[PDB]
Design a binder for this molecule. Structure first.
Ligand SMILES: CCCCNc1ncc(C(=O)NCc2ccc(S(N)(=O)=O)cc2)c(N[C@H]2CC[C@H](O)CC2)n1
Ligand SMILES: [Cl-]
Ligand SMILES: [Cl-]
Ligand SMILES: [Cl-]
Length: 256
C-alpha cells in the first residue's frame, strides 16, 4: 500500500485533517492526477495507525465502479491517503449548482434515482465484505468522469442513527440510516437535513418518533423506501441489497 513519496507532487488545497491535489507518477511512466488526504492520528501508540494500515490493505483490493479506488499511502511522520481526482467534484455541490443557471440543468427524477442506485451498489459491495463507512453523506459521494456516483471518504449528528447516539454503536444498518438521509439530500437537491431543528435537539426529536419530512415533488413510493431506513429497530431496516433493487425497480418504471 505504501508508495515512495518522491512519486508524489502536491499542490493546491481542495478541502479543510485536510485534502490536497497532486500528481502521482505511475509505474507506466505516466503522471496521474490524484487527491491527497492527510491523516492526524494519535502517535502516542501504534493502535490507530495499525488499524489504518489494515484498512488500507483492504481498501486497495476493492474494485467496483461505484466505489472509490485507493492508490496507496505516502509518508513524509504523517501518512497521506492517495485517491483519484474528480474534476466534477462531490455530489452535494453539484445539486446546488443545478438550481442555478450557467451550471448544470434541472436534474430530472430519473437522473436523481440513478445516483441512489450507484451509492446503493457501492454500499452493497462494502456490506458483503462487512466494511463500514461511518460517514455516508452527499458531500462524500464523488462524481466520476462518466457522471456516475461513487462512495468515498470512508476511514454530523443529523446523519448518525438514533442507536448510534445513545449506545454509540455502529453496524451496517447504521449506514443505511445515513444512506436514507443521502437519498433525502438528492431528492431535495442539497437541502440541510431537519430544517428548524438544531444538532443538540436531534436525539429527543428522533426518539419521539419524528423523522425527515417528505419533499413536495417526491413520490410516495420513494419516501417509503427513505422512511424504511429510519425505523427505530435496526433489524426492521432493509439491507443495501434490497434498497438497490427497489430503486432499480422504481427507476425502470419511469420513462426516459
Ligand atoms: C473523499 C475524497 C474524494 C476523492 N478525491 C477528490 N476528488 C475531487 C475533489 C474535488 O473537490 N474536485 C473539484 C475540483 C475541480 C477542479 C479543480 S482544478 N483542477 O481547477 O484546480 C480542483 C478541484 C476532492 N476534494 C473534496 C474536498 C472536500 C472533501 O469533503 C471531499 C473531496 N477530492
Ligand atoms: Cl511535493
Ligand atoms: Cl438548501
Ligand atoms: Cl424534515
Amino acid at each position: 500500500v505504501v508508495i515512495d513519496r518522491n512519486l508524489l507532487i502536491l499542490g493546491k488545497i481542495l478541502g479543510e485533517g485536510s485534502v490536497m491535489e497532486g500528481n502521482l507518477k505511475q509505474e507506466d511512466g505516466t503522471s496521474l492526477k490524484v487527491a491527497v488526504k492527510t491523516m492526524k492520528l494519535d502517535n502516542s501508540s501504534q493502535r490507530e495507525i495499525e488499524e489504518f494500515l489494515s484498512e488500507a490493505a483492504c481498501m486497495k483490493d476493492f474494485s467496483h465502479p461505484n466505489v472509490i479506488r485507493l492508490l496507496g499511502v505516502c509518508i513524509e511522520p504523517k501518512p497521506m491517503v492517495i485517491l483519484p481526482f474528480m474534476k466534477y467534484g462531490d455530489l452535494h455541490t453539484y445539486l446546488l449548482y443545478s438550481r442555478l443557471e450557467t451550471g448544470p440543468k434541472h436534474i430530472p427524477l430519473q437522473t436523481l434515482l440513478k445516483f441512489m442506485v450507484d451509492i446503493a451498489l457501492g454500499m452493497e459491495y462494502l456490506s458483503n465484505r462487512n466494511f463500514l463507512h461511518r460517514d455516508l453523506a452527499a458531500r462524500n459521494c464523488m462524481l466520476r468522469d462518466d457522471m456516475t456516483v461513487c462512495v468515498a471518504d470512508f476511514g454530523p449528528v443529523k446523519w448518525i442513527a438514533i442507536e448510534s447516539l445513545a449506545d454509540r454503536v455502529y453496524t451496517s444498518k447504521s449506514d443505511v440510516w445515513a444512506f436514507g438521509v443521502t437519498m433525502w439530500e438528492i431528492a431535495t437537491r442539497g437541502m440541510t437535513p431537519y430544517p428548524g431543528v438544531q444538532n443538540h435537539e436531534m436525539y429527543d426529536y428522533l426518539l419521539h418518533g419524528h423523522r425527515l419530512k417528505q419533499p413536495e415533488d417526491c413520490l410516495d413510493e420513494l419516501y417509503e423506501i427513505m422512511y424504511s431506513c429510519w425505523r427505530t429497530d435496526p433489524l426492521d431496516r432493509p439491507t443495501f441489497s434490497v434498497l438497490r433493487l427497489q430503486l432499480e425497480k422504481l427507476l425502470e418504471s419511469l420513462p426516459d
